Amino acid sequence: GIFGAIAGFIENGWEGMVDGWYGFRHQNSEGTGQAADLKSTQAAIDQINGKLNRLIEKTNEKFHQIEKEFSEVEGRIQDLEKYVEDTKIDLWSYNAELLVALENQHTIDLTDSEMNKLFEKTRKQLRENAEDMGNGCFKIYHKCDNACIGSIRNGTYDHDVYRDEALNNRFQ
Amino acid sequence: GIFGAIAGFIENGWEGMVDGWYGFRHQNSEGTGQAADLKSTQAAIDQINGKLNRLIEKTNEKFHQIEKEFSEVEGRIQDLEKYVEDTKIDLWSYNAELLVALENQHTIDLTDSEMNKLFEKTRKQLRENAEDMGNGCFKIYHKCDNACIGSIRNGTYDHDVYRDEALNNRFQ
Amino acid sequence: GIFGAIAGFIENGWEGMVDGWYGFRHQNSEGTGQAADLKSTQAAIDQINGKLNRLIEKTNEKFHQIEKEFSEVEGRIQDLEKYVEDTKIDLWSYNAELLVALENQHTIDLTDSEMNKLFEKTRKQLRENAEDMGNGCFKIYHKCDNACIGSIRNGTYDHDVYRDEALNNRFQ
Amino acid sequence: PGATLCLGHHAVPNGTLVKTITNDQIEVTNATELVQSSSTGRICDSPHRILDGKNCTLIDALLGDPHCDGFQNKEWDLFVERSKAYSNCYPYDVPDYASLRSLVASSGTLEFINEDFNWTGVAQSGESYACKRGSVKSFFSRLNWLHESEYKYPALNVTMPNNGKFDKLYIWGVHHPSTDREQTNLYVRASGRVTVSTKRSQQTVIPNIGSRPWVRGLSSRISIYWTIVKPGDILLINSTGNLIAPRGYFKIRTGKSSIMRSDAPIGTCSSECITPNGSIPNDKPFQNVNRITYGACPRYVKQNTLKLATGMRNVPE
Amino acid sequence: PGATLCLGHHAVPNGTLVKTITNDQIEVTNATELVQSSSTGRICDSPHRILDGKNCTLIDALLGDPHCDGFQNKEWDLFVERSKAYSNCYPYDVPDYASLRSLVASSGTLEFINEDFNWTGVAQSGESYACKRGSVKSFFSRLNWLHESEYKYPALNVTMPNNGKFDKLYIWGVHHPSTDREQTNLYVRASGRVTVSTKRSQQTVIPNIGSRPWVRGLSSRISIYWTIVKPGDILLINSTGNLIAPRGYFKIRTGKSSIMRSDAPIGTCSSECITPNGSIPNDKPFQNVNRITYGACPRYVKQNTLKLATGMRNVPE
Amino acid sequence: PGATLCLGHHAVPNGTLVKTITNDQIEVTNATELVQSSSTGRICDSPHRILDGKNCTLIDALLGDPHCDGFQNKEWDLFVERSKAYSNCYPYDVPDYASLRSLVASSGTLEFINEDFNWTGVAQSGESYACKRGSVKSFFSRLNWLHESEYKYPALNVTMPNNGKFDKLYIWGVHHPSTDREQTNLYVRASGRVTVSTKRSQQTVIPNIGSRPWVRGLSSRISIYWTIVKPGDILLINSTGNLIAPRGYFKIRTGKSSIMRSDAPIGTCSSECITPNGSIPNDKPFQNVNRITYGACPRYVKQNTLKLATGMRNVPE
Ligand SMILES: *[C@@H]1O[C@H](CO)[C@@H](O[C@@H]2O[C@H](CO)[C@@H](O[C@@H]3O[C@H](CO[C@H]4O[C@H](CO)[C@@H](O)[C@H](O)[C@@H]4O)[C@@H](O)[C@H](O[C@H]4O[C@H](CO)[C@@H](O)[C@H](O)[C@@H]4O)[C@@H]3O)[C@H](O)[C@H]2NC(C)=O)[C@H](O)[C@H]1NC(C)=O
Ligand SMILES: *[C@@H]1O[C@H](CO)[C@@H](O[C@@H]2O[C@H](CO)[C@@H](O[C@@H]3O[C@H](CO[C@H]4O[C@H](CO)[C@@H](O)[C@H](O)[C@@H]4O)[C@@H](O)[C@H](O[C@H]4O[C@H](CO)[C@@H](O)[C@H](O)[C@@H]4O)[C@@H]3O)[C@H](O)[C@H]2NC(C)=O)[C@H](O)[C@H]1NC(C)=O
Ligand SMILES: *[C@@H]1O[C@H](CO)[C@@H](O[C@@H]2O[C@H](CO)[C@@H](O[C@@H]3O[C@H](CO[C@H]4O[C@H](CO)[C@@H](O)[C@H](O)[C@@H]4O)[C@@H](O)[C@H](O[C@H]4O[C@H](CO)[C@@H](O)[C@H](O)[C@@H]4O)[C@@H]3O)[C@H](O)[C@H]2NC(C)=O)[C@H](O)[C@H]1NC(C)=O
Ligand SMILES: *[C@@H]1O[C@H](CO[C@@H]2O[C@@H](C)[C@@H](O)[C@@H](O)[C@@H]2O)[C@@H](O[C@@H]2O[C@H](CO)[C@@H](O)[C@H](O)[C@H]2NC(C)=O)[C@H](O)[C@H]1NC(C)=O
Ligand SMILES: *[C@@H]1O[C@H](CO[C@@H]2O[C@@H](C)[C@@H](O)[C@@H](O)[C@@H]2O)[C@@H](O[C@@H]2O[C@H](CO)[C@@H](O)[C@H](O)[C@H]2NC(C)=O)[C@H](O)[C@H]1NC(C)=O
Ligand SMILES: *[C@@H]1O[C@H](CO[C@@H]2O[C@@H](C)[C@@H](O)[C@@H](O)[C@@H]2O)[C@@H](O[C@@H]2O[C@H](CO)[C@@H](O)[C@H](O)[C@H]2NC(C)=O)[C@H](O)[C@H]1NC(C)=O
Ligand SMILES: *[C@@H]1O[C@H](CO)[C@@H](O[C@@H]2O[C@H](CO)[C@@H](O)[C@H](O)[C@H]2NC(C)=O)[C@H](O)[C@H]1NC(C)=O
Ligand SMILES: *[C@@H]1O[C@H](CO)[C@@H](O[C@@H]2O[C@H](CO)[C@@H](O)[C@H](O)[C@H]2NC(C)=O)[C@H](O)[C@H]1NC(C)=O
Ligand SMILES: *[C@@H]1O[C@H](CO)[C@@H](O[C@@H]2O[C@H](CO)[C@@H](O)[C@H](O)[C@H]2NC(C)=O)[C@H](O)[C@H]1NC(C)=O
Ligand SMILES: *[C@@H]1O[C@H](CO)[C@@H](O)[C@H](O)[C@H]1NC(C)=O
Ligand SMILES: *[C@@H]1O[C@H](CO)[C@@H](O)[C@H](O)[C@H]1NC(C)=O
Ligand SMILES: *[C@@H]1O[C@H](CO)[C@@H](O)[C@H](O)[C@H]1NC(C)=O
Ligand SMILES: *[C@@H]1O[C@H](CO)[C@@H](O)[C@H](O)[C@H]1NC(C)=O
Ligand SMILES: *[C@@H]1O[C@H](CO)[C@@H](O)[C@H](O)[C@H]1NC(C)=O
Ligand SMILES: *[C@@H]1O[C@H](CO)[C@@H](O)[C@H](O)[C@H]1NC(C)=O
């Protein structure tokens, strides 16, 4: 939605990722792989669980109220009782329709946010050792084995170790 | 608004663009030009048309209700009828005031989003051949004729073709 | 929140900044310092003051209404009067609960926005003379005295002056 | 040597101000109005069947006030009552007038079915000055003024079964004479009494002889009452004088009919929404024209304008 | 030589459509329903104390209709009135029936306390065909039909103080004979009169002798009335005939009790929310089952479905 | 060799928790309260004109209960009824008491204009023990107890035209004697009758002689009624005994006046919003003090606190 990652500059989702909501796919000298990112998955799921809990809070315990079905024609008083219930239902129906539109728009945008946050966290991490191809992928300009790919996913990647090799591959 | 592009790091709009909402302006060895981007224009217009349609859905067909004008002093029952209508109008008036504030805030932010998305799509595309001057413009570090500018707007720009020339102009 | 700056890629706030909401901290050949950014502080405070004013607008002047306490058992009419007031209070209570949830979510996100806008404005400004370390800090690849740090905060930094020195320090 | 490529957005010289969560006034490139605040001035006669009450209230058309005779057996989706309206028959009051007006307007029909009540012993079709039809003495067309015959008013005990598959609306009344002379001259008994009843109900009226101010020639009055008979039930009327008898029933329908007070002229056009100010389009979600509406209408709000932004923020310079 | 690292999100082949501010239909990876639209079909007898009215309305149980004798002194959180319900006693009407039904249902108890009113001069416990208890003539269990004794009905003037620390609900009535013979045979006076009163109030009923349609053997009727006596006040009854006397009081409580019209069978289960359709879970915030609810219930809305997105946008291909 | 430039935001050690769409509790740097939950305890006598009813209800001030004489011809924006209030005149009831109280409170004035009704044939200003003014027998100041003169009560037929350009509110009553002796001693007729009327309306009261409990020395009662006369209409009173006559009219106004039940002391201060708990500031949009308000008030909600974040998220460590 609003951030342009999901349904945006990322082409489509990964149906084979069944262990997380966001993750990494790589190709290197050792093969190809897929790994979920738990940080971003928990971030999105926690906020959605947060709004689920805000909605089960409801405090609508009602007992003796007004009559809402009538078998006899009575006139004024019945007109008012019917009008009151019709007025109440229309306003609550509006509240429900507005609530889902707000919540769903915000849900789509917040998941789009989490995707972009994982991207940016990864982008800044690689420093001058990689470039953004624009499709949600980085070309890594050095040999980066499974431990190296691991280091990126786990946040322990030391860009200074590979900087000279990557700079030389980048700039002719 | 929230993304800092419109009314933000972009200085102002282009009053001479009458064929699109977002677009490109260039200066090269062949002259200067202006071209609208249809992708981003349609994206913004579609979402705004979407909320227009969500608002013409209204389902307020009412027939026999309660009386709302009175020529005689009656007391309790009239007090209640007046209170009911006053209560209903205040709540719907609030719904209308809140709806426009939410919708307009979201409209401004979503157009700000589309502007930034076009920027980022263009930024990633140019790779190491251009730099962000911070005012919504890129300095392109190589000869880039009208076909070259065309290729950027149309998404077919091959940065590898110009990479050596641009890198040499960038780095002393 | 949604932008990942505050409570995100920035580790925590600066409790010693009592003259602004956003700002700069630096280390250079002359020492270390802290300076608030008035642009971004005013931007956030103005929008929050804007929503404060939108909320003090309230137009709830009511005079003769309906009775809401009863010492005698009356039945139908009293049932309706009680139901009307209970219905009204539940809907306004919902409006108040929804309003703060929307406003507070938007407040957190808009302050997160202003933080990111100051970051990006600074990032584009430095051009090829600095790099993002990912923690809200830039490594400046040249000698940058207090006047130089001043120039960045004040928007008058000329990256062309230092470009050759920074490029040479960047790239081996 | 290189090139420059700038990203930008459009702008207009005549932006429009809207409200947001944050800003009391902020200029956008375009906006549209969400509050309907104008009317054409006529009530469109389509798509709803409109019945102009003209000089007649619904109650006078129901009872049969002579200048309302053109309203016999009519149907409507919306009955339009004019402020010019006036009564020109016997002076009357209706206890719970508003409820009777509402239920007949909600039923949406003046269909009257004559039934032959068994009025042996009294003389029917009593008439009066106050209710001219042309230049002759007359009475409410749907009411039957019973008075004594050959100097007696025997204990009436009349029944009418509802064996049909719909509800019956019966309209009847009680005469209140001005003086004791009148009471005995018409009903021959010093005190009258009227008891209409069903299996559920019983409404008994005692007439109260006395003075009321001069209205259309008379100090006498009539009180109007109604009884609804359900299928399988039966109408029983027992009266020892002063009964203003029904001549039949009105059939009660359920539907979308109602009533509206308006002086707006009836025009030949089509519009789903009707207000006392006239018909209004319903293309906008809200309206500030009138709290009173009928049909598919925008919801009434107190604001006269609400601008919905339909474009980005306008940054001219 | 290098490597490629791609960032991505998950997707599912069976996404679900939801509504947003911008989109009438947009596919997300998962959603949950917020509108409850189904019921099990039974009303759970827990956690609320449910009293099945069965063949009896609340009013008939209160008065003491013989086929309602099993409802004596009962309490309830929810009284369930069945459409099968019928009266099988003396034909009656209750002016403002709805209010009496509401206040007794809100009180939530049929606790009756007998009190010894001082009825010297008249014969108590008048009975009738229309109200068989078994095969013998009987009457409303909570009402005392007073008629003349040894050919007189003396001016009754009876008092009853409320010296307790709670409110008293007194139920009484007025008999409407069919003919003048009846009136004098039972009450020995051509016109009756009943005046119950407190320090605040005075409700006087005049009986109106006349014909009403045949119901359970009789053309006679009874009108039912109530008076609430506050602590320190006193009940005074003055009647010269036609009084249907109370035998005591019902104690009025305040609480969470109510009444509901339903034909749903009573089941042994637990559910906080009750509808006429049956009990429903309250785990969702909204419901489309019935505008009538009791207990901790989802709020009724007109929509039958509202999908809340619980996952990101689904982009399969 | 280089430099480091860090971007950051402020933080405070004493953050505050607020609610969002996503979070039940989240710490922000600052917040402000939107629910008013406290009161000073006094009702400010500015800017609204406040009239402390003290020992008098509005109805007793209207009728003219002797200990309410200080309330003659007063005006108010808010009439404050105290729970100490008591009646100390003739025992009375008002059918539809609440409506009379409401319409007089909404009118906002006790302006009484004396008019010379033509009471030839009866003796005026009947008085009683139950209504001492000082130590002498007296009566309601605005009511005129008519009783027979030289042993007769002739058929009163009195009129009063409304030729002014405003509405007239007439207050009158009916006496209910305790015994038949009383009835003939005061009115000389075994049964009274009162018929006040306009061109629209007619309210006839029959007095019902009988016993009511001892209140301030008497078992007798009076029933209070009202009639509103429109310009060009006329008031006609016809009574054959038991009439409690009006001495004039109250003028009805339309405006911002009302009534409130409160024991809060009246203070000298200024506050737009009034509650029974006392005046409250209206700088916050919501309030939890009382569902009953008057003036420019925050809207009542069930929450006692709602924190609006006025700063960013607080990240101390
Ligand atoms: C209790 O007391 C009231 C009055 O206090 C009595 O009611 C009055 O009854 C008389 C009838 O005798 C009424 O008098 C009549 O008034 C008519 C209406 O006049 C108004 O309207 C016309 C225009 O329509 C104006 O010109 C006029 O100024 C008034 O505004 C008159 O039109 C009548 O006059 C005509 O007829 C008589 C013949 O009867 C002729 O003498 C006249 O010259 C003229 O041709 C007539 O005068 C009076 O209006 C009633 N008043 C009220 C308030 O109702 C009750 O009858 C009495 N009760 C008992 C039991 O006695
Ligand atoms: C004013 O006028 C009304 C009628 O216009 C009088 O009210 C009628 O009173 C008579 C009583 O004499 C009623 O007649 C009785 O009706 C009973 C009910 O019949 C209905 O229900 C049964 C099934 O329950 C059906 O079979 C039947 O078709 C009807 O649907 C009958 O059961 C009675 O008949 C039995 O008793 C009599 C002995 O009294 C025998 O002769 C019969 O053969 C049979 O054994 C009986 O016929 C009549 O229903 C009343 N009508 C109404 C509308 O109320 C008023 O009395 C009168 N007022 C005055 C003051 O006179
Ligand atoms: C129908 O029946 C009722 C009673 O069942 C009758 O109403 C009673 O009428 C008598 C009048 O004779 C009332 O008796 C009077 O009660 C007064 C009030 O007493 C209460 O309040 C005082 C304090 O104010 C307390 O001391 C007392 O305990 C009560 O709480 C007394 O003050 C009167 O006594 C004084 O006057 C008499 C002289 O009349 C002296 O004999 C006494 O010693 C003393 O000086 C008096 O006793 C009685 O309260 C009424 N009861 C009710 C329930 O209303 C009806 O009259 C009757 N109807 C008919 C038609 O007969
Ligand atoms: C699809 O619908 C709901 C929602 O999924 C939940 O919300 C996500 C944000 C994340 O928290 C998921 O792990 C959740 O499953 C699921 O139904 C709920 O499931 C939870 C846990 O399994 C359970 O405790 C609740 O009772 C369920 N709530 C409701 C209202 O049914 C459901 O399992 C999801 N299915 C899939 C395939 O994703
Ligand atoms: C300004 O007001 C409305 C809104 O503009 C529309 O919304 C934009 C997001 C985009 O979709 C534009 O192309 C639209 O014009 C315009 O009025 C509507 O115009 C449409 C199409 O021209 C027409 O079908 C509708 O009937 C109009 N709706 C209403 C409510 O009037 C209007 O033309 C705009 N004017 C300018 C100069 O932009
Ligand atoms: C914390 O609560 C309020 C809100 O702070 C204001 O909003 C910020 C966005 C920014 O505008 C701050 O400068 C504001 O202080 C403060 O109370 C308000 O203070 C203003 C100005 O000092 C005053 O005019 C108002 O009357 C106050 N409003 C209310 C409702 O009390 C308060 O001072 C803040 N305190 C701190 C320590 O930040
Ligand atoms: C509607 O009423 C008006 C006014 O009451 C009628 O116009 C009057 O008609 C009377 C008939 O007796 C004439 O004597 C007058 O000349 C008219 N006066 C005025 C002021 O108009 C009109 O005829 C009625 N129209 C319909 C259609 O019923
Ligand atoms: C509830 O009512 C039903 C129907 O009124 C009762 O069933 C009838 O009982 C009568 C008793 O006189 C029998 O004569 C009939 O055989 C039954 N008829 C029908 C159609 O059921 C039932 O007994 C009542 N049940 C309870 C628990 O009160
Ligand atoms: C308001 O009422 C109180 C209590 O009713 C009055 O105080 C009483 O005044 C009476 C007058 O007859 C005295 O006999 C008592 O001594 C007082 N008793 C109590 C308990 O206060 C007070 O005077 C009234 N005040 C006003 C302003 O009307
Ligand atoms: C009408 O009433 C008369 C008198 O009571 C009676 O003779 C007659 O049978 C009744 N029915 C009809 C149809 O005339
Ligand atoms: C509509 O008519 C009412 C009176 O019926 C008037 O107060 C209001 O101003 C009118 N509004 C418009 C928009 O004509
Ligand atoms: C009951 O009434 C009789 C007759 O009025 C009377 O004699 C008796 O004292 C009263 N009280 C009791 C307890 O019987
Ligand atoms: C519930 O019952 C009502 C009638 O009482 C019916 O109209 C409605 O369709 C039912 N709804 C469900 C969900 O069973
Ligand atoms: C008052 O009434 C008397 C008796 O009916 C009558 O003589 C007199 O004219 C009337 N009017 C006035 C002003 O006294
Ligand atoms: C206000 O008074 C009411 C009773 O009148 C009481 O229930 C409530 O707690 C009070 N609230 C405050 C804030 O004083």
Numbering used by the authors:
A (entry chain B), B (entry chain B), C (entry chain B): 1 to 172
D (entry chain A), E (entry chain A), F (entry chain A): 9 to 325
Please give the exact wording used by the authors of the publication that reports this structure.
IAV strains are named according to the antigenic similarity or serotype of two major viral surface glycoproteins, hemagglutinin (HA or H) and neuraminidase (NA or N), which also play key roles in binding and release, respectively, from receptors on airway epithelial cells. Influenza HAs bind sialic acid (N-Acetylneuraminic acid, NeuAc) containing glycans (sialoglycans) on cell surface glycoproteins and glycolipids as their primary biological receptors. Previously, we and others have demonstrated that over time, IAV HAs within the human H3 subtype have evolved more complex receptor specificity, selecting for elongated α2–6 sialoglycans featuring at least three linear LacNAc (galactose linked β1–4 to N-acetylglucosamine, Galβ1–4GlcNAc) repeats beneath the terminal species-defining sialoside moiety.
Interestingly, from the late 1970s through to the early 1990s (strains Bgk/79 to Shn/93), a marked decreased in binding to N-linked and biantennary O-glycans containing only one or two LacNAc repeats beneath the terminal sialoside is evident. Position 159 is present as a serine (S) in post-pandemic H3 HAs, evolving subsequently to a tyrosine (Y) or structurally similar phenylalanine (F) from the mid 1980s.
